């Protein structure tokens, strides 16, 4: 049973082991085939294998619903390299290729083992009789819904087409349904379980957010006499973890505006921590050179706009400081998460001010208004604002920082080992929050 999976994992996919025990558990739950399965794992965590490997071990065919043809083509190309009998039914096909594939699907024992299809195609009149005979001959082993968050108006990429999939899942009652995505809050997950008609109990495999080696804190700029000086000492502590070597590792400072970038770089450089600005304002050549200087550790600190952001990863980022609050919890998570990739201790600090909150609050309304003029209203618009309010709440509440990140994304209470300001000294955080209330 576990041997069949290991055998196929090697002989077909050419892997000695699963990337993670979570990927393994997901894969085994799909193989057993007794439950609907929800897989929520970031890009690169091997989500695809969690349905592709079980598809090869089942007796019948696996249908994979994916929302655009670019995405479909990605895995078809890869599975073909593996000598897997994959097909795609889409309109980027000759009328002849379409008919050849529909004919294959009418066979007792189709050549096709895995079929990739758009939600458009899965509903189209052309396909219904094919789908019906696949049902009738009990040839469907799995229905897979990729990008399952697209069914939710509260996710970032709602698609009406996805609303038909619950009906499809119901008709394919014989077969287990696997739904996958990189991105789902608890509300998006509840929408996925309801709108796709997933059968309870739904087995869930969700990669935790929690980063044990990241120390999170929020500082209130309004309560600090020398903000720039506070930031410099933060940089010094974080870059000072091997004093013998001198300066060790690197850091990112995130800012809202190009001006603030340029200015923060000058202020830091003055105070003894060499920092260079990286933003859309610079010539392409200047950006390549600044990024290079950071990558090769000529310059230890890079100051970037949240808007332009960072194009490249680095293993020894010892700190990420948000000078200005980010636009969303997800943005903050991703930007701060550039820290500590090598697994060594790193520091993530958010410099909060109600003045910054109000600036961003309003800019978000403006960018939402601009989208509403060009394409009308959308429940995503409310999502964008709540995504920011979650981060404001993170800044203004007392409570474990890792716990607040976990709660937003729908993870279990994480094991913070005095790994944030509130868990290290609850009273000091309370002190600072009480002080911020007085400045109101």
């Amino acid at each position, epitope marked *: 049973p576990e041997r069949r999976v290991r055998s196929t994992l090697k002989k077909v996919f050419g892997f000695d082991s699963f990337k993670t*025990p*979570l990927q393994e*558990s997901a894969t085994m739950a799909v193989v057993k085939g007794n439950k609907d399965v*929800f897989v929520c794992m970031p890009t690169g965590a091997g989500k695809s294998l969690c349905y592709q490997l079980p598809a090869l071990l089942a007796k019948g065919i696996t249908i994979v619903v994916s929302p655009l043809i670019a995405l479909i083509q990605d895995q078809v190309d890869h599975l073909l390299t593996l000598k897997v009998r994959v097909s795609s039914l889409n309109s980027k096909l000759s009328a002849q290729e379409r008919k050849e594939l529909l004919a294959d699907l009418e066979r007792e024992k189709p050549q096709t083992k895995i079929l990739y299809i758009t939600p458009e195609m899965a509903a189209s009149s052309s396909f219904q009789p094919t789908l019906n005979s696949l049902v009738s001959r009990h040839l469907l082993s799995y229905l897979v819904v990729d990008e399952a968050h697209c069914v939710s108006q509260w996710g970032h990429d709602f698609r009406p087409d996805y609303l038909r999939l619950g009906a499809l899942r119901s008709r394919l009652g014989h077969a287990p349904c696997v739904a996958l995505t990189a991105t789902a809050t*608890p509300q998006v*997950q*509840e929408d996925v*379980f309801a709108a796709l008609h*997933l059968k*309870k*109990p*739904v*087995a*869930i*495999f*969700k*990669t*935790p957010c*929690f980063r044990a080696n990241l120390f999170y804190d929020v500082q209130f700029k309004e309560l600090i006499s020398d903000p720039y000086g506070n930031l410099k000492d933060f940089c010094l502590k974080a870059l000072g973890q091997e004093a013998d070597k001198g300066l060790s590792g690197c850091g990112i400072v995130y800012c809202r505006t190009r001006e603030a970038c340029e200015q923060l770089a000058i202020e830091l450089s003055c105070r003894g921590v060499n920092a260079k600005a990286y933003h859309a304002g610079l010539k392409a050549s200047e950006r390549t050179l600044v990024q290079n200087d950071w990558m090769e550790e000529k310059v230890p600190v890079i100051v970037a706009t949240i808007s332009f952001g960072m194009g490249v990863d680095k293993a020894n980022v010892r700190f990420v400081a948000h000078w200005n609050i980010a636009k969303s919890m997800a943005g903050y998570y991703q930007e701060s998460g550039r820290a500590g990739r090598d697994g060594k201790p790193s520091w993530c600090r958010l410099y909060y001010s109600r003045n910054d909150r109000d600036q961003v609050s309003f800019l978000i309304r403006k960018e939402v208004a601009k989208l509403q003029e060009k394409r009308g209203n959308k429940a995503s618009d409310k999502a964008t604002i709540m995504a920011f309010d979650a981060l404001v709440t993170f800044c203004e509440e007392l409570g474990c920082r890792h716990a607040a990140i976990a709660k937003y994304f*729908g*993870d*279990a*209470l*994480p*094991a913070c080992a005095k790994g944030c300001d509130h868990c290290q000294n609850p009273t000091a955080v309370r002190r600072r929050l009480e002080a911020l209330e007085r400045s109101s």
Partner: nanobody
Amino acid sequence: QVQLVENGGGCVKAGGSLRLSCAASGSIFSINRMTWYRQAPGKEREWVAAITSGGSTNYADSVKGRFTISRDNAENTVYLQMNSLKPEDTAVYYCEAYGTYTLAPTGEGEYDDYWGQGTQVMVS
């Protein structure tokens, strides 16, 4: 998975009060709808009261005013305060945990409905 264990049920005189408590065990993140049911001897199950996560409540007409459903968010526990009890209220009371999201720090979880065991309520 999850255990729903109801308590607070006991023999009581008419006009009196009880408070029923249902505790939900396990790695619970959230419960969509929590509903109080009761089963009177030789009657069909009767819907009593429900509370959403969010605290929106609703009551059968036979109990509105007398019964109040509430939640301790901290403890995954719901309460049914019952005042002005009548013989008609004599039943076994159990709770339904509809849309229960469980999840371990490993990232393995479940979405399911759970049913309690029942607590005996006897009104003289």
